[PDB]
Amino acid sequence: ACTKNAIAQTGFNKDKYFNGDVWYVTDYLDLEPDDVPKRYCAALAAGTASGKLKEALYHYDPKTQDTFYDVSELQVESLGKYTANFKKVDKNGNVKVAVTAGNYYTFTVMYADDSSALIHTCLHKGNKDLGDLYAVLNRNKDAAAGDKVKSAVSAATLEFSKFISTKENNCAYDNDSLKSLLTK
Numbered sequence: 420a421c422t423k424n425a426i427a428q429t430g431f432n433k434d435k436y437f438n439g440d441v442w443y444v445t446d447y448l449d450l451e452p453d454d455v456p457k458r459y460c461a462a463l464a465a466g467t468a469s470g471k472l473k474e475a476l477y478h479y480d481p482k483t484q485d486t487f488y489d490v491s492e493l494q495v496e497s498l499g500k501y502t503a504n505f506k507k508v509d510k511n512g513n514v515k516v517a518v519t520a521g522n523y524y525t526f527t528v529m530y531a532d533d534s535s536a537l538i539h540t541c542l543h544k545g546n547k548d549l550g551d552l553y554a555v556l557n558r559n560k561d562a563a564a565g566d567k568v569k570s571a572v573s574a575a576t577l578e579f580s581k582f583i584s585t586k587e588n589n590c591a592y593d594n595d596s597l598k599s600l601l602t603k
């Protein structure tokens with residue numbers, strides 16, 4: 420179940436966030452913690468491609484090796500808050516599971532600057548959801564969370580100490596695929 424109406428950053432700069440570059444998840448918190456593994460790897464690219472607002476996602480379970488990519492065109496609900504219907508693709512953008520009604524995520528940018536961000540997502544996959552999932556992002560996959568983003572975690576009435584880091588999982592990413600997938 421998702422339970423939070425995440426508030427988007429006041430003054431969110433959409434063009435900076437959606438600049439075509441990659442964001443790495445460094446830390447995450449699911450309010451239903453058993454919905455996701457204790458060890459995980461994830462990243463995304465976010466950009467406008469031929470006028471269309473896009474995200475490309477990458478998930479990797481470092482223990483099971485379960486791997487998947489997704490592409491979505493985001494619809495705007497308000498500045499910094501989006502609804503994304505996703506398609507599972509291979510790294511080259513070939514469709515494995517087409518877009519469908521019931522497959523979407525919400526995506527709220529709670530805080531962002533040039534290097535760091537805090538997001539909330541609620542994933543819906545038919546009648547399943549994966550809970551309220553918060554993620555700390557950085558442009559540098561190895562960056563420890565700094566004071567701007569940690570303060571934003573506090574401002575959301577969360578505790579950064581409870582987030583799970585992705586940093587000790589040997590995560591290696593294909594940035595080229597993420598960038599190219601924005602067009603797909």
Ligand code: HEM
Nearest residue numbers: 444447455456459461463478489505506507524540542554
């Ligand atoms: C920016 C952040 C994230 C977004 C927008 C997001 C989005 C999604 C989407 C769209 C799917 C469905 C993929 C498909 O079936 O095509 C998915 C699945 C999944 N995500 Fe995420 N995710 C994010 C971060 C994470 C993180 C950090 C974790 C783990 C800690 C995670 C764990 C999972 C798992 C385990 C699944 C598979 C669910 C299933 O097998 O049905 N995700 N996510």
